[PDB]
C-alpha cells in the first residue's frame, strides 16, 4: 500500500497536430465510363416536326 | 281438226317498273386507303425530352 509517488497530470496537449492524412491522388484511367446519365438541350422548330 | 274463230283481245295494261334514279354512285374501296400523305401535329414540352 506504500507509493511514495503517485500523480495525476492534467495534459490539455491533445495531438490536433498530425501527419498529412490524405493518401497519393489517382489518375482514374481504367473506367470513367462509370458514368451513364445526361441531359440533351435541344429546341423546337414549329411549322415542322 | 279445224277451228273457227280465231280471236285476240286486250284486257289491262301491266306494270313496268322505273327502278333508275343513277344508283350507280362509284366508291371503290382501294383508293379510300390510296392516300399515304400525312402531317404530325407534335406539342413541344420544355425541361422534358
Redesign the interface.
Known amino acids: 500500500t506504500y507509493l511514495d509517488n503517485l500523480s495525476i497530470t492534467e495534459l490539455n496537449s491533445t495531438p490536433e497536430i498530425l501527419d498529412e492524412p490524405e493518401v497519393k491522388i489517382p489518375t482514374d484511367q481504367e473506367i470513367m465510363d462509370a458514368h451513364k446519365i445526361y441531359?440533351?438541350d435541344?429546341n423546337?422548330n414549329p411549322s415542322t416536326?
Open positions: 441531359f440533351a435541344l423546337f416536326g
